[PDB]
Amino acid sequence: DSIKDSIKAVVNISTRALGSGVIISKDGYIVTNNHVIDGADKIKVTIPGSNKEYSATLVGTDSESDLAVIRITKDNLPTIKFSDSNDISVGDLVFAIGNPFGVGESVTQGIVSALNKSGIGINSYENFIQTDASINPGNSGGALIDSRGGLVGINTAIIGIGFAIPSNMVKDTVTQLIKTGKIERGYLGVGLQDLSGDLQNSYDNKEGAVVISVEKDSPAKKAGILVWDLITEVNGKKVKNTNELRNLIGSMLPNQRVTLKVIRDKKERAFTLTLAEETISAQNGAQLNGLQVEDLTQETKRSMRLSDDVQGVLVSQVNENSPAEQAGFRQGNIITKIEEVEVKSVADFNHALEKYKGKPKRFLVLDLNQGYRIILVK
C-alpha cells in the first residue's frame, strides 16, 4: 500500500552526483552505501518533488558492510520502513528505487533471484540479495522494496543483475550509527554460501550455511573450522540459511560465546567459539538500550581515585530517557555482579548478557556517592 511513500523517501546524494539514499527516520537520518559518500566533503541531499538542496552531515560509516548514514536538518520527512529480510523468498516481486540526479527517480520492477550471493561487493565476504533489477551507480544506495512497499534491502552497485544488502543487516548498522556513531559487532571470520543450489542440497540436506572461506586470525580459523563445513545450527536454533546466521551473529556482542553444529564429511561436530571485534567503550544497542560501559583501567581507577578493591565495569554514559536510564543506571556507577558472574571487564559483562539472554538478571551496582543498589532487568 505504501509504495507512494517509498518513492518519496529515496533521495539524491551529491557533492557531481554521487548516488542515492533512503530516509529512514522522519527526524533526518538517511542510509546509503559507504562507497557512495566515501571521500566527499560537501554532501548535499535532494528530496523528490523539490529542487532545494540540504547540507548533510556524516553520522557514521560501516565500510565492512558498505553502508553509511548521513543526516539533514528537516522534519516531516517521508520514510521507508524496514521489512524482515529473513522473510523474503526467491521469486518475490521487488522494486529498485534510485534518484540518480536531482530530478525524477528510476524505478525498476523485478524479482528476487537469489537470497545470498557474495564475492561481488567491495567486501568479497559480504552477502547480498540478488535480483534481476539492474543496479547502476545511480540507484546505488537506494531502496529495494517488496510489493507492500517495505524495505528489504539497500541497492548496491557492483564495482540484468542487481544486488541489495539485506534490510535486517542494514537496520543493525543504522541503529548503531545513529545512537553511537560507531559500529561495534562481534566478528566471526567466515565466508558463507547457501546450500540452496538444490544440487548440494541433494548431497547432504539439512540446510544451513557452508563456509567457502575462513578469514584467518579469526575466531573461526583457530576454532578449526574448514572450508566446506556446513553450519546447521546456531546456539540451539536451526539456521535456515546464511542470512539467518549473519543476522544472528550480527545482533550479538563482541567476545560472546557461540556453539554451532557442523556437518563435515557428514561427520557431525561440535564448535563453540568466542567472537572477536584502547580499553574502550560498548553501547547498547539492538532491554538495556542506552547503557554505555567500559573497563576500569588502572589509570581510570586512580584518576577516579578508588579503592579498594572495587572491580567491575564503569557505566561511562547513560543515554537520557533510555531503557537503561528508566532502569536506574547512572553515569559513574560501577556494575560488579550480574547473577553469578563477577563482572570484572566488558568481557565478563558481555558473557553475562549471553549467559542470561532473555532471562531475569540481578545487577549489583555500586553508586560511589549513594552505596550499592540492586537493579533487576527483564
List residues forming the annotated binding site: 35, 66, 138-140
Please give the Cα distance from 161 to 113 (Å, whole number): 9
In the three-class reduction of DSSP (H, G, I as helix; E, B as strand; rest coil), residue 366 is classed as strand
* H-type alpha helices, 160-310: 167-180, 219-223, 242-250, 298-303
Known active-site residue 124 = no
Q: Which of 35, 62, 118, 167 is catalytic?
A: 35
Annotated binding site for substrate: 35, 66, 138-140
Closest CA to 10 of 77, 62, 65: 77
Rg (CA), the chain: 22
Q: Which of 6, 140, 167, 345 is catalytic?
A: 140
Buried residues in 262-295 as b, exposed as e (16+ CB within 10 A): bbeeeeeeebebbbeeeeeebbbbebbbbbbbbb
Known active-site residue 140 = yes
Please, which residues bridge with residue 151 across strands? 82, 145
Known active-site residue 66 = yes
Residue 198 per-residue DSSP state: S
End-to-end CA distance of the chain: 36
* Residues annotated catalytic, as ranges: 35, 66, 140
